[PDB]
């Protein structure tokens, strides 16, 4: 029966993301994706009536760190793309960690829980790249990086968001499972080709 298993099994779509992030020396992102994969998978396993006996912690914990992990995964994907130098790199990481924690803990189902991170990270990226385009007097991330990484990564990102927050009204079992695959692919595409601060 698909209802129980498909959203639980599609949660393993982030395991390629953990693998690829590890291979490119993005270890802090690979932690956040693995943490997310665990809490997203066990949130779906704990919800499915036929394997709800499995979960070792309460629904409140798994539900919180499913949502928190997802929103933080979106933040560290876009901060990896922003490619900051230190001391801003760790400051911007800590900013997402602390603001997503307080917001999600206030209301995990409220507005701004995913659009706050995505909107703020987009504004940070846009300001950095427009400053760099004035310095370069030219398109800053190479047209290769736009056509291969940013364009496809934001297409799978936008597809994931409209699967979850529009099309999921029609169906859950298949649409939510496609959201996992689209968001995992979005994280893979938005992540740079190697961590320039570790290799």
């Amino acid at each position: 029966v698909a209802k129980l298993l498909l959203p639980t099994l599609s949660s393993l779509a982030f395991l390629p993301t953990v693998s690829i992030a590890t291979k490119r020396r993005f270890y802090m992102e690979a932690m956040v994706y693995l943490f997310t994969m665990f809490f997203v998978a066990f949130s779906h396993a704990c919800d499915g009536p036929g394997l709800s006996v499995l979960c070792f912690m309460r629904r409140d914990i798994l539900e919180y760190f499913s949502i928190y992990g997802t929103a933080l995964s979106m933040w560290v994907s876009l901060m990896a793309l922003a490619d900051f130098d230190e001391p801003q790199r760790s400051t911007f990481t800590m900013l997402g960690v602390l603001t997503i924690a307080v917001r999600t803990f206030h209301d995990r189902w409220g507005y701004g829980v995913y659009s706050g991170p995505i909107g703020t990270a987009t504004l940070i990226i846009a300001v950095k790249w427009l400053k760099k385009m004035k310095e370069k007097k030219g398109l800053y991330p190479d047209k290769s990086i736009y056509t291969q990484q940013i364009g496809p990564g934001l297409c799978f990102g936008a597809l994931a968001l409209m699967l979850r927050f529009f099309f999921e009204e029609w169906d859950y079992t298949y649409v939510h499972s496609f959201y996992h695959c689209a968001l995992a692919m979005s994280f893979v595409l938005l992540l740079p080709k190697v961590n320039k601060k570790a290799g």
Partner: antibody
Amino acid sequence: QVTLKESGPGILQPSQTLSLTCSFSGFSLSTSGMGVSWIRKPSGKGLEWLAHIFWDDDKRYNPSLKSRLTISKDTSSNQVFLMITSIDTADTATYYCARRTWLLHAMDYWGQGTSVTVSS
Amino acid sequence: DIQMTQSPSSLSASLGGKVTITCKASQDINEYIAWYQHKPGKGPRLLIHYTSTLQPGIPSRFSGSGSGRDYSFSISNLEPEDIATYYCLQYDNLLWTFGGGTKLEIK
């Protein structure tokens, strides 16, 4: 098709001004994100960048020559001019005019280049 | 400025052969390296930009690689039309700097 073509004196004696001209077609330098640049190959030596001039009327010069270079424009004529002041015999070079764009920041078309020989 | 260091000043190779030119920058140029082919009595052609991207219409034997401070450029299935001088350009800063060049010869 894009073209650039250089013009110059060919021969001058030292301690005066070298007034290089570049004429171009297939683009306008007042087009958004468009640039023209000067490079020279000195006599028996590798390439040396001299000057930039841009669509937004911005300019750059090589710090080694920033004191004696001056670059200027004429979009009406589809032309750029480079003035090099106080000629030395070290300025014996072929001078090239090259077009840079917004999407690739490196130059994508060069002119054939003009040979300038300078001695007494 | 940034100093660009093409390792072979000149290189002799057989027709149908393979050639590799290496360049070291004194400071990292963030893959903003381009490779130009120059011939006596002609303006240089852009072959490759941003380390690896071939310019459209450029025969696919030309390849380039590197990221950080060390880059390389290669010609494969070498034609007699490849006998030319090859220059790398650092264009990370608008303070442009070329390499010393590599004069390719027949064998």
